[PDB]
Design a binder for this molecule. Structure first.
Ligand code: ANP
Ligand code: MG
Ligand code: MG
Ligand code: MG
Ligand code: MG
Ligand code: MG
Ligand code: MG
Ligand code: MG
Ligand code: MG
Length: 286
């Protein structure tokens, strides 16, 4: 495989555009061996084939001067939803196309499929606009299963891995931050994905035009925490002071943003049990 154009760095590795046609090649720091392992575990055994999930190609360890860990996936030339939202504006058609496709990806991860072509129930745990890619057909796929937890109904076995990495601090649910999440109950990881999905929903809705105007792209809690907030930083905002992103008033002059602020509402309850499910979100968006 021919590494051609690097397209990013990160806190855990780097991503290249290579050929083998075009493929993406994430190259992990060996300080992040556990994420490469976990991701390679899920893709090679769960067989995750779905429109709204980053398709997988292969996984290997090679040369390069030294023993780098490669995860080779479908290349999407339009990149992250995060970079996409800072470049472009959305209308009604492209914005619903995007939040629905994310919702169906998260739902398909969250439900256990039984049968030959089945899968366990999977919770993402680091969902964010940088971990969603936009592909050249309107849909988006979810990526980075490095922290994924799995649950199999047949055994009631919860499988959380041994990755010491924690999710992106900005998108953490309050139960994660105050450290009262039930670690034994798989559903609480599903409710962590929903909280972050609500944040992503706010990110996307801002960039949808209505009555001729938009908001600039901003990351969640942009107005109250610094770039790269730390653990204690987000704790003050989400748990103690109980802050949520603000709804622009111009959403109440459009019926779509009306019912998009409807959803975010019901992913943001601090009590995680009250939060919507990805199936319910995906149902509502249809
Ligand atoms: N399959 C892919 N196709 C195209 N671009 C991709 C792909 N996977 C990742 N990227 C982009 O490559 C860049 C490198 O990012 P990456 O190292 O994967 O994580 P990140 O963007 O830094 N987010 P984070 O892991 O939270 O730090 C980002 O701009 C990604 O959007
Ligand atoms: Mg980067
Ligand atoms: Mg399977
Ligand atoms: Mg990533
Ligand atoms: Mg990514
Ligand atoms: Mg991935
Ligand atoms: Mg990873
Ligand atoms: Mg493991
Ligand atoms: Mg900020």
């Amino acid at each position: 495989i021919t590494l051609l154009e690097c397209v990013g760095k990160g806190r855990y590795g780097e991503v290249w555009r290579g050929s083998w046609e075009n493929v993406a090649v994430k190259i992990f720091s060996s300080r992040d061996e556990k994420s490469w392992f976990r991701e390679t575990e899920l893709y090679n055994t769960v067989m995750l084939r779905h429109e709204n999930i980053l398709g997988f190609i292969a996984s290997d360890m090679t040369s390069r001067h030294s023993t780098q860990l490669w995860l080779i996936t479908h290349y999407h030339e339009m990149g992250s939803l995060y970079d996409y939202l800072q470049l472009t504006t959305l209308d009604t058609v492209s914005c619903l196309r995007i939040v629905l496709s994310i919702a169906s990806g998260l739902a398909h991860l969250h439900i256990e499929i039984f049968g030959t072509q089945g899968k366990p129930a999977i919770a993402h745990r680091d969902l964010k606009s940088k971990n969603i890619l936009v592909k050249k057909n309107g849909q988006c796929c979810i990526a980075d299963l490095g922290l994924a937890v799995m649950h199999s109904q047949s055994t009631n076995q919860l499988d959380v891995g041994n990755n010491p990495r924690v999710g992106t601090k900005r998108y953490m649910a309050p139960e994660v931050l105050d450290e009262t999440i039930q670690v034994d109950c798989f559903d609480s990881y599903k409710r962590v994905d929903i909280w972050a999905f609500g944040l992503v929903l706010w990110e996307v809705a801002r960039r949808m035009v209505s009555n001729g105007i938009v908001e600039d792209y901003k990351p969640p809690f942009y107005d109250v925490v610094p770039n790269d907030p730390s653990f204690e930083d987000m704790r003050k905002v989400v748990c103690v002071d109980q802050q949520r992103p603000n709804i622009p008033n111009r959403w109440f002059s459009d019926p779509t943003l009306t019912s998009l602020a409807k959803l975010m509402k019901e992913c943001w309850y601090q009590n995680p049990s009250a939060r919507l499910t990805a199936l319910r979100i995906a149902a509502t968006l249809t």
